[PDB]
From a paper:
Glutamine synthetases (GS) catalyze the ATP-dependent ammonium assimilation, the initial step of nitrogen acquisition that must be under tight control to fit cellular needs. The dodecamer is organized as two stacked hexameric rings, and each polypeptide is organized into two parts, a shorter N-terminal domain (β-Grasp fold) and the remaining C-terminal domain. The active sites are located at the interface of the N- and C- terminal domains of the adjacent subunit in the hexameric ring. Two loops in the active center are critical for catalysis: the Glu-flap, involved in shielding the active site during catalysis and deprotonating the intermediate product, and the Asp-50’ loop, which binds and deprotonates ammonium.
The enzyme from [name] was crystallized in the absence of ligands, and two different crystalline forms, referred to as MsGS-apo 1 and MsGS-apo 2, were analyzed. MtGS-apo-TbXo4 was selected as a template for molecular replacement, and the structures were refined to 2.64 Å and 3.09 Å, respectively. As MtGS, the homolog from [name] has a dodecameric organization with the N-ter (1-106) and C-ter (107-442) domains forming the protomeric unit. MsGS-apo 1 was used for the following structural analyses due to the better resolution. A structural comparison of the monomeric unit reveals that MsGS has a closer fit with BsGS compared to MtGS (rmsd MsGS-BsGS: 0.749 Å, 341 atoms aligned, MtGS-BsGS: 0.847 Å, 338 atoms aligned), which exhibits larger deviations such as an extended helix α2 resulting from a seven-residue insertion. Unlike for MtGS, 2OG was not required for MsGS activity, and its addition (2 mM) did not affect its activity. In the 2OG-insensitive MsGS structure, the side chain of Glu89ʹ substituting the MtGS Val94ʹ would collide with the 2OG position, and its negative charge would additionally lead to the ionic repulsion of 2OG. Moreover, in MsGS, most of the residues relevant for 2OG coordination (Arg88ʹ, Arg174 and Ser191) are substituted. The Arg62ʹ is not conserved in MtGS (substituted by Gly67ʹ) but is present in MsGS (Arg61ʹ). As suspected from the sequences, the addition of glutamine (20 mM) inhibited the activity of MsGS by 97%, while no difference was observed for MtGS.
Residue numbers in the entry:
A (entry chain E): 3 to 58, 65 to 83, 87 to 442
B (entry chain C): 2 to 58, 65 to 81, 87 to 221
C (entry chain D): 3 to 58, 65 to 442
Write the structure that this text describes.
């Protein structure tokens, strides 16, 4: 069994401590460090703890044996186990983001549907001044630049190496448009494994950046005036092993299932934005003039819309949702896209006409004529749309949905009352 | 193919873990996509997809040239100069490397082959607070010898790194201005010489840092 | 005549330069300095200039002779300076409708046709901050509190100089005192007609900022310069007079308050969301409209005991009046009084009944009990108030299509710049964790 394999790796690598990893509703990794003597207790009846940390009272940590990995930074060695949360009686805790994704995937599996996700993770590597992180780029590099213009090649090389040592396959990595910005493109995997992988990448990137006296951040818009970090999610739906998005006889080799999936995602996209773009800062990224989509449109590969339909066909047929940012909870994000996309397939929701023209170049009178909607401008605006979306509230559960609203409105009420420096710069001298 | 089998032999032998899919924009600036060694089979076969908006200054495929596989002498890393093609398979005429290849093929129709041997001049400046300056590292003149030429070890390393990448240099010397140097290249076809010029700039800037 | 009196004061005080003062749509004072030799030309055919500054082309400055005042800060070599508030007019002779002073004059003339005259007595709050390296800061000069006395109130000498300089310009002040927040102060003006009061408000801001710079300090009329402390407000004590007598007083009516008072209050409260764009015009003005401080946030009117948007004080007879507590001192006074007059008179004309007086503490009530009484909220953002102002046909017609469009264009230019900015709060809240 898998438990016997774990104990063999323990004695082989001399593992002395294991981290019982888990995540709160905001996507922040949390853990309970236990000595190796308690590993048998964790894999059996489980370790007890206080579940009020997930909100932002007593529960049990249920380790997933398939997620046992030895941390490559040699201590004696350390290991980790991604855990599912359960109530003391044994029933699953509906407030756990990982359990929410698992449910939604099980609902899809009943209908023979399996979603594969391959996200494009953008992030920044900033300098550290006086032991505190800053928003000053470590390098002055541009799009796809090579060293010495890209100074973060060794840190990126070290990230991908550490990931490969933990059963992780990366497609490609490169320098992005903004100074000190980078991207690591993941390969296709199931929604659960991909979300586990996203959390691991953030943890590894931030740990390795601190080792080099730097700070890695997955913030959507850390610097004003430059490109913001996005999480373009390459999504493909598979029905009974075959690609449900491919139809060789249909126009443009696009199945009806792709159209209905796109239609469903676009119908609830304003509500999904509260999950995929959850911070107040996420809306400073959703502004024109940068790579991030702002208008609600879908189109082919040449134009940069909210949903893109790339050229590859056959088993590689897929869509690219480019609205999310890397600060979102991946478990809740993929669950929201799966629920909205499957509702479109079920109810046969037809998507709007493809906007192949450059949407940014069109004037407001042209955009109004074509009926192009816009993504929420503020966090408050997306949470109001998410509150009314009965599908997503039921898909994520009343516990997760309420926690998202409570945390977002606590941040919004604190942010709106603040007097920012922009106001002092614009009004103090004149008024 | 066999060139591909040769590449995978060098990978296991020197323990290559990452490969750089090099290419160049219209301005001559080197650009690349770093892929782990697991994706090398995918790169040499159907190719790696990327965004072609960088070449100007939105979807294309990187086609590695197997003859350009070289292990970077500094776990090991390797490089591959790539040609750009459109998703359908046709060559992208905006790629500078494809443009020189075309013009050379037209000349080859008339039985003509051009050989180029450039004299590459450059400066080696000091760095102040991690940022580059225009202050010469040395106060040397034309064909000067150490200790007047302080950059003799860096130039020695540049030519040594180039030789380790199937590259032969004719001669190197200090130039007229302070901190100025020149590396005279051997004769070769226009494509190999242009590949070599890009490699020299990359190696010289990397070793200077 | 008044021109002959001006030239006698010129020769007496040795005035050598005159400032042809005027204001843009935002309430910021602008001027054209002319030597005394050109004063006859200014009072006669007028001085020409570029009107592009008013929005935020060729026009004429028309000085108001009643506004001629010698600036008390004596210039170099016994030479003196004088000022003249000017009205803007087009080269043909017609008044330029984009001038805020002309807009208030129009609205007052429309009220005068019906025998109505509005008197205003604003409570001007402001902060006195320190200067570091020649630039202004938001650091209070003093650490004083409500009605505090020296040495707790360190700005007593400068406030004394402000009121003294104002008295030397035909300006009477009712009282001055230290306010709740550190380095905050208030100067309560006497009651006067809307035009004279608006002229006086502009003069106070100019004098306070000039005298603050003389003492190495910075006076600001910004609504919310510091987070967590009280913000500066402009509570406008308003009274309406019909044919010399107070139109707000009725000895036989309940509470000795006339029907004209209730209809005036009803009209102001109907258009208050739109008035907020004029009276609270900056992005920062909405950081002042937050609970927990003196500033009103809910749309209610009540007696003196409770602090509400509109408060009806105890004094009766000729002193019967209402107190509109929502405006801030950064507003254009010419436009603020014109908007209050137009909304208040529409209520009197159309007989608009105001909602029931909310005597209970509105802040202490839970969010459930507020909807039951039909209690509304002032706009939360500048964009939200501008959207309400854009749809208010009464205020757009009262201020004119030129002034209304300029207010929308300037406010949206500031909003669009502010919303895209990445503030320090976001870096402090998200950079380390995400
Ligand atoms: Mg993409
Ligand atoms: Mg008051």
């Amino acid at each position: 069994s898998k438990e016997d394999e774990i104990f063999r790796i323990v004695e082989e690598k001399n593992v002395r401590f294991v981290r019982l990893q888990f995540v709160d509703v905001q996507g922040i990794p949390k853990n309970v460090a236990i000595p190796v003597g308690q590993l048998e207790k964790a894999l059996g009846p489980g370790i007890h703890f206080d579940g009020s940390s997930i909100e932002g009272s007593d529960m049990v940590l249920r380790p997933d044996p398939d997620t046992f990995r030895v941390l490559p930074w040699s201590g004696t060695a350390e290991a980790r186990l991604i855990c599912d949360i359960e109530l003391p009686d044994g029933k699953p805790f509906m407030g756990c983001p990982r359990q929410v994704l698992k449910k939604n995937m099980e609902e899809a599996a009943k209908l023979g549907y399996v979603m594969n996700t391959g996200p494009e993770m953008e992030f920044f590597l900033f300098k550290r001044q006086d032991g505190m992180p800053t928003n000053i780029p470590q390098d002055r590099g541009g799009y796809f630049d090579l060293a010495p213009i890209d100074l973060a090649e060794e840190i990126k090389r070290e990230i991908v190496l550490v990931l490969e040592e933990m059963g992780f396959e990366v497609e490609a990595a490169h320098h992005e448009v903004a100074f000190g910005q980078h991207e690591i493109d993941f390969k296709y995997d199931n929604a659960l494994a991909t979300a586990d992988n996203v959390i691991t990448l953030k943890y590894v990137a931030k740990t390795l950046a601190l080792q080099h006296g730097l700070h890695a951040t997955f913030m959507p818009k850390p610097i004003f005036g430059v490109n913001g970090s996005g999480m373009h999610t390459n999504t493909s739906l598979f029905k009974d092993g075959k690609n449900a998005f491919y139809d060789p006889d249909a126009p443009d080799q696009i199945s009806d299932t792709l159209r209905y999936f796109v239609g469903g995602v676009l119908k609830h996209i304003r509500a999904i934005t509260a999950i995929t773009n959850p911070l107040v800062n996420s809306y400073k990224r959703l502004v024109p003039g940068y790579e991030a989509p702002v208008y609600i449109t879908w189109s082919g590969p040449n134009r940069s819309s909210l949903i893109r339909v790339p050229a590859p066909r056959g088993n590689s047929t897929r869509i690219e949702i480019r609205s999310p940012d890397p600060s979102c909870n991946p478990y809740l994000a993929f669950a929201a896209i799966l629920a909205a996309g499957l509702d479109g397939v079920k109810n046969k929701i037809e998507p709007p006409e493809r906007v192949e023209k450059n949407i940014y170049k069109l004037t407001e009178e042209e955009r109004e004529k074509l009926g192009i909607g816009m993504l929420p401008g503020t966090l408050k605006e997306a949470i109001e749309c998410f509150k009314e979306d009965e599908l997503l509230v039921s898909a994520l559960g009343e516990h997760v949905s309420q926690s998202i609203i409570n945390v977002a409105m606590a941040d919004w009420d604190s942010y709106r009352t603040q007097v920012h420096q922009w106001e002092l710069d614009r009004y103090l001298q004149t008024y | 193919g066999s060139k591909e089998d040769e590449i995978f032999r060098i990978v296991e032998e020197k323990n290559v873990r990452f490969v750089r899919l090099q290419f160049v924009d219209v301005q001559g600036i080197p650009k690349n996509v770093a892929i782990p060694v697991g994706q090398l089979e995918k790169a040499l076969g159907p190719g790696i997809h990327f965004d072609g908006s960088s070449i100007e200054g939105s979807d294309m495929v990187l086609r590695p040239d197997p003859d350009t596989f070289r292990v970077l002498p500094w776990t090991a890393e390797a490089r591959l100069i790539c040609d750009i093609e459109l998703p359908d398979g046709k060559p992208f005429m905006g790629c500078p490397r494809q443009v020189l290849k075309k013009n050379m093929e037209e000349a080859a129709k008339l039985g003509y082959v051009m050989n180029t041997g450039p004299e590459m001049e450059f400066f080696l400046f000091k760095r102040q607070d991690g940022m580059p300056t225009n202050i010469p590292q040395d106060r040397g003149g034309y064909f000067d010898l150490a200790p007047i030429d302080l950059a003799e070890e860096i130039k020695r390393e540049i030519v040594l790194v180039l030789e380790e990448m199937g590259f032969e240099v004719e001669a190197a010397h200090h130039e007229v201005a302070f901190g100025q140097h020149e590396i005279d290249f051997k004769y070769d076809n226009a494509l190999a010489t242009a590949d070599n010029v890009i490699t020299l700039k990359y190696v010289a800037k990397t070793l200077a840092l």
